[PDB]
Amino acid sequence: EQESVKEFLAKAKEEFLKKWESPSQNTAQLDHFDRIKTLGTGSFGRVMLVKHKETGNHYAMKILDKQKVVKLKQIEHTLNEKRILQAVNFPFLVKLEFSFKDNSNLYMVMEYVPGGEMFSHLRRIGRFSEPHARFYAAQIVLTFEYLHSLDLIYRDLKPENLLIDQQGYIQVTDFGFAKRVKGRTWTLCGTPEYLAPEIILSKGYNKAVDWWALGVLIYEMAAGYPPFFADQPIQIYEKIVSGKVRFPSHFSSDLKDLLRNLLQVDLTKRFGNLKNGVNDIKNHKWFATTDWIAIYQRKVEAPFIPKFKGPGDTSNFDDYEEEEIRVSINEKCGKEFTEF
Template sequence: MGPTNSTKRSQTEIHTFLEKEKERFIEKIENPIRQNANLDDFELTRTIGTGSFGRVVLVKHRKDSEKENIALKILDKQVIVKMKQIDHTLAEKKILQALSCPFIVKLLYTFKYNSYLYLGLEYAPGGELFTHLRAIGRYTEDMSRFYSAQMVLAFEYLHHLGVIYRDLKPENLLFASDGYLKMTDFGFAKRVKDRTWTLCGTPEYLAPEIILSRGYNKGVDYWALGVLMYEMSAGYPPFFADQPIQIYEKIVSGRVRFPNHFSVELKDLLKNLLQVDLTRRYGNLKSGVRDIKEHRWYKDVDFIAIFQKAVPAPFIPRTDKENYEMYDEQPLTVSPSERFPREFLEF
């Protein structure tokens, strides 16, 4: 069988696989899991992350020994309501519980109790890509290729389901024990049929169409992919400045300067991802993600082998040491009665 027929066959197999995943996703979206645990089921160990709406605590399940460590995301209802993030929070839980991808954290448990909402997530012990990248300085192109290929596959999966992620950045990519990545934090994820207009994301990673308040779609994820690939390979993002407004001006200008050590192939791919003109941006064209997967920078990458985790990772995190920052522990202040029952009825 020639390479052309082989490519067609693999494309057909991928499409068939994604269509089955879409059916499974829709079934789970229409019949989401509700309360499948409570706080007494877990033994709290320590805080491994904090955010605007709460924190993430490393916990152990008291009864299920197979799930040795779980990252329990604890969200404060009052803060969510105050910051008008109810819809984003409900969407995060609804979407995450329906996803099944090797490069996305699994939602294992979900429950609510009085003051808080709880999401029990698969624990990635290797810490953030952000921390690892800062420690090394910058990745080789081979490393950037390996990690970015996983994000290409994650986006191919999400976009086939009609979901855009909108929050790709090194802080939201965690190392599993096998050295592969897990995408986390789906607070900005959204099911989109055509376009959406919400301004959300991290300044350095925002696509021009978001900044210019134009309707946007999956193209914003591929712009962010370009930013990530650049940052991994350079050690710094393509657009940075002291103030967000200055960052936005640079992004909208579309002018990108490349370090001398970038290969010709990497520069070419980045020019097509960091493309202000949506009608020319890779991932957003007629061939979709194939323009990226078949680009010459990825010529030696077997995406199916990456998906199956058959390619040895260039870095295996040590799991016998702490890979997350230490935080001051604070007790949970739980209300004696259910807070905002109507607002979080669907959680």
């Protein structure tokens, strides 16, 4: 690897470790913000658009209910998410601006990316051309190069987690499954269509699962549907473990070749997990037109700029029932979340 990349990653790791070892805590509070709109909702949390009452800045505030986090066995995952997010710094990762907790909830206040999920744009257009898919894929390759060099595995790559920013570039959001791992880890997590075989088979797995997921993502971007599609998860898992994938005839030969090497069932043969590491991907013919430095510097013109009216526009997100942010008069689960 060019000494340039080595020295870049060495500095990246130094800076990450300093923040990792001494995490920020308690850097805002709820009544500093006005609530605008619910942008997403799940079994233990929500994402709200909020506005800071003094600066006027908009943020995406992730609110996690401590009691539900405990019930659904997400304690360590939520602590991972916040400790990692406060320590990382890369152009294609959504930035954590503040975090805090109260009697009921955990809060992560992120930059608000108004362009919407890649998922929405992909489903609206059907499929992306290979250059369009390649632009996004290159950002993910660089992001994983960064994360993996810090001993971080992301574990939730899917189109819904990739937001399109005001310049048409990707921002990765949702670090709920991200973890600092030297060696192997074992937790079953991830959306079914994106799970690597070794996750399905309950093995001790490593960063190779992220490279598998990149193969799934690239396939889905270029085809409009994922490679192991079936109606129910068990049928998806059978397809994943089988070692068989069918490519549309419109795929280029270079794309098919890259995908066979990312969607390699044998993790010891999978691109991104060999002796040359990420360079087997970066140097593949499918990426021959990619100027990696120019992508990193955000100097490439993007495939499209999302349509939105301003930093507070929510048009590219969808509509959810608006529920209270209630804060109990009694502290819940204080011990479990001491470090947050």
